[PDB]
Amino acid sequence: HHHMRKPIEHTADIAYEISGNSYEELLEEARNILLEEEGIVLDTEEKEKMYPLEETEDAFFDTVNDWILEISKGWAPWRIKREGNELKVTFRKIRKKEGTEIKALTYHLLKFERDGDVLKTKVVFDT
């Protein structure tokens, strides 16, 4: 008989608490996390996509995960501009990456909480 240490797999790998005064600022913080965590260095070429400005965890989840898909295609979220009830996201071509590859934003602990002027939530990513 034996015991063999084995690796544990988690979808909850890294966590941050993001805060801001609006849904758009939480997305700006999700963007900041992706660039920083992945050590993304940007080229100058740009590309843009539209996302619905819906202040829900579901829209947040869909948006950030779409950014991760774009990152796998060589494009990183860079700027965010509100246009009516939608958000125009400008992506920049990724020159290089140096860091931890983020696989996805999970639904773990994703819940917007209001505290005065502050909107906040934990965001848990899978690596």
Q: Which residues are annotated as a binding site for Ca(2+)?
A: 10, 13, 126-127
Distance between CA atoms of residues 110 and 113, nearest Å: 10
- Report the nearest approach of Ca ion to the CB of residue 83 (Å): 35
- # binding residues, Ca ion (CB under 5 A): 2
Site for Ca ion in 10-39 (CB under 5 A): 13
Distance (Å, rounded) from C-alpha 94 to C-alpha 75? 6
Query: Does the protein bind Ca ion through residue 126 (CB under 5 A)?
Result: yes
Find all residues with CB under 8 Å of 79, minimum gap 6, and list them.
89, 90
Task: Point out which span in 6-14, 63-71, 78-86, 104-112 binds Ca ion (CB under 5 A).
Answer: 6-14
Q: Which two tokens stand for residue 27?
A: 């997305």
Q: Alpha-carbon distance 17 to 124, whole Å?
A: 9
The vertex-63 CA angle with 21 and 119, nearest 5°, equals 15
CB of 43 to Ca ion, least distance (A): 29
Instruction: State how far the Cα of 15 lies from the Cα of 126, in Å rounded to an integer.
Output: 9
Binding piece for Ca ion, criterion CB under 5 A, among 16-24, 74-82, 86-94, 118-126: 118-126
Q: Could you give the string, one character per residue 39-58, with x where binding to Ca ion holds by CB under 5 A and - elsewhere? A: --------------------
Closest contact distance (angstroms) between CB of 104 and Ca ion is: 9
**Residues at the site binding Ca ion, with contacts judged by CB under 5 A:** 13, 126
